[PDB]
């Protein structure tokens, strides 16, 4: 029994007669279901028996209350940049990912492979692999009540791990589609032999008329990762214990917890859309994607080096690459509005 964060996780061991002479103990799959569903509750919402949202035939739906000032105190936690810059005035697309966490964790809680379920064998080995956002031109600015719907596809297992793709769509009160998010999750332990399909570049908003104009630098911004993840946890919503708890990080087989993929996602988006007064237009994102590569411990000095890639009917294609020392931790692409 492990106290993870306020509550307990029970793992039950069974000992056959094989364990008399060098036999390993076995952990039954239903005991591991119970342990991973209660840590799924600790990740998303209060208790595992029927407080996570119900799974439909394929989907999981939620209706949440949206306020625009929560975007402001989101950016106040995320954007901790240097001196000369300034955050944007329009809202950033990594703010709708906040209220839609119980939908995607409920989708993980019932997502299955081809005859087998990744709820159990890898929830402590869960990594947010990559993220992709596509916005329609609407974005609310009044206090409203919108809804989200997340579908988990049939998970495969490629040469780096078991990939669970999940696609959520967010619509307002009038039935208008606001935005569409697609993200993949890597279960890191178990693998197979299947080809890993590459995700869509710039969130699927490339209009198939793009020329490889030569690269031009835009900005170089150094951002330090914060020490504790509970502020970004309470702001965003994911209480995934791998980012905060020490016992859960040791239980997942890490030396120390890791920062949020959505944290450095939102840091990259603000490094794109920040302003410093000189003669350039502001940035407003339309399509976006970000691939996560390595782990970032809390207290590392990330630096973004944003460049220009292409052009598409007056709007330009812009990528970032984040480094910690001399390797990559993400690679992200974007198509911003004209």
């Amino acid at each position: 029994s492990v106290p993870v964060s306020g509550t307990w996780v029970d793992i039950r061991f069974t000992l056959p007669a094989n364990t008399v002479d060098g036999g390993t103990p076995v952990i039954a799959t239903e005991d591991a279901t119970s342990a991973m569903r209660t840590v799924l509750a600790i990740a998303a919402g209060v208790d595992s028996p029927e407080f996570l949202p119900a799974v439909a035939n394929g989907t999981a739906t939620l209706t949440v209350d949206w306020h625009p000032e929560r975007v402001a105190d989101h950016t106040g936690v995320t954007a901790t940049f240097g001196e000369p810059l300034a955050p944007s005035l329009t809202n950033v697309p990594d703010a709708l990912v906040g209220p839609c966490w119980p939908a995607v964790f409920a989708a993980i809680g019932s997502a299955v492979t081809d005859t087998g379920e990744p709820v159990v064998e890898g929830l402590l080995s869960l990594v947010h692999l990559d993220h992709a956002a596509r916005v329609v031109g609407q974005l609310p600015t009044v206090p409203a009540q919108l809804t989200v719907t997340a579908t988990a596809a049939n998970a495969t297992d490629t040469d780096m791990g078991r990939v669970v793709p999940v696609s959520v769509v967010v619509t307002g009160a009038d039935g208008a589609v606001i935005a569409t998010l697609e993200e993949r999750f890597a279960i890191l332990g178990r693998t197979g032999s299947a080809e890993l399909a590459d995700p869509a570049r710039a969130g699927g908003a490339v209009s198939a008329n793009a020329t490889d104009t030569p690269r031009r630098r835009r900005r170089d911004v150094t951002i330090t990762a914060p020490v504790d993840m509970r502020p970004f946890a309470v702001v965003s919503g994911d209480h995934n214990p791998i980012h905060t708890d020490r016992a859960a990080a040791l239980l997942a087989g890490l030396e120390s917890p890791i920062v949020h993929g959505m944290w450095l996602s939102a840091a990259a988006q603000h490094a794109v859309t920040a302003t410093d007064g000189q003669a350039r237009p502001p940035a407003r994102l339309v399509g976006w994607t970000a691939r996560f590569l390595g782990m970032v411990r809390p207290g590392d000095e990330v630096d973004f080096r944003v460049e220009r890639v292409g052009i598409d009917q007056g709007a330009e294609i812009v990528d970032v690459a984040a480094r910690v020392g001399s390797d990559l931790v993400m690679s992200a692409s974007a198509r911003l509005a004209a």
């Binding site: 104009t213 030569p214 690269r215 031009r216 630098r217 302003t275 007064g277 000189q278 003669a279 350039r280 237009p281 502001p282 220009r308 052009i311 009917q313 007056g314 709007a315 330009e316 004209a338």
Partner: protein, 305 residues
């Protein structure tokens, strides 16, 4: 490298190309025909000398250090017009601070340069008066109000029947009125009491049944009327630049890039844009001003470092 829903501005003679190019409300054959007819009809509405001369020149005046502004310049022009006994008019509101254009008769022109040179030797050397190079017709003034009716007839001859009003609504800035082209009772009343428009009074009477009945027809009539009267009405280009540079909050069209399409040997509109930006009413507005020939590399986005 051409965005789609960008709005259409321009100087009052490139305004025709602003209709034709970035909106496509008509095409370049009718554009070139209309342009040649308005040139040939402008050329023959002034009784001039038989040796080519006239009694009409214009001049760029510079209210710099001589203590003139928006509340003082038209009263100044009317006062020197009453002192001389001639017709003196503003024609081009080019720059807020130090670039105005005055068209009139030659006697009023020497009265203008007399007062400007004596205030110049009062306050310091500025070269505040430059007479126009070459051209000799008082543009956009009251004395051009017969060719506007004949040009209305030629315009109804040239321009096609069916108009799409949404191709210019929220996208067009004329020069006699510096506001967006919008189907408004206030808009048609403003052009009506700015310049008397004899076929517009029936629309000024009623439009609620006519918005129900004749949207394309009514937009077509107000379009040809407002396009015909700028041949004799002065421009309000200072207020167009203010309407383009004042942001969306504190209402006005807040834009990001201001690209003008002209040659690099004389980027005049880009010079006026940079001067209005460096004017001290605002020093923080990041409005990137491009020429389509000086800044070709950064316009087509084919530049390295």
């Amino acid at each position: 490298a051409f965005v789609e829903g960008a709005i259409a501005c321009g100087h009052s003679v490139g305004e025709y190309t602003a209709l034709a190019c970035v909106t496509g409300i008509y095409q370049l054959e009718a554009l070139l025909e209309m342009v040649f007819h308005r040139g040939s009809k402008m050329h023959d509405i002034v009784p001039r000398d038989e040796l080519g001369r006239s009694n009409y020149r214009l001049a760029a005046i510079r209210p710099s250090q001589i203590d003139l502004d928006d509340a003082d310049v038209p009263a100044f022009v009317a006062g020197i017009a009453e002192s001389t006994g001639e017709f003196l008019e503003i024609v081009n509101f080019n720059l807020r601070g130090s670039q105005y254009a005055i068209a009139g008769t030659v006697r009023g022109l020497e009265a203008l340069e007399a007062e400007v040179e004596r205030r110049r030797e009062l306050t310091g050397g500025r070269r505040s008066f430059i007479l126009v190079p070459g051209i000799d017709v008082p543009f956009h003034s009251r004395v051009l109000r017969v060719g506007v009716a004949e040009f209305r007839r030629s315009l109804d001859r040239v321009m096609p029947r069916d108009a799409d009003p949404d191709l210019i609504i929220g996208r067009y800035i004329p020069n006699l009125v510096p506001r967006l082209f919008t189907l408004d009772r206030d808009f048609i009343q403003e052009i009506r009491d700015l310049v008397p428009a004899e076929p517009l009074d029936e629309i000024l009477a009623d439009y609620d049944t006519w918005l129900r009945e004749r949207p394309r027809e009514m937009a077509r009539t107000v379009f040809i009327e407002l396009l015909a009267w700028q041949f004799a009405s002065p421009v309000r280009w200072i207020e167009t630049q203010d309407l383009l540079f004042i942001e969306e909050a504190a209402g006005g069209l807040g834009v990001e890039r201001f690209v003008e399409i002209g040659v690099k040997s004389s980027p005049t509109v880009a010079g006026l844009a940079t001067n209005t930006l460096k004017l001290p009413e605002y020093a923080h507005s990041t409005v990137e001003v491009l020429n389509a020939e000086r800044d070709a590399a950064v316009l087509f986005a084919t530049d390295t470092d």
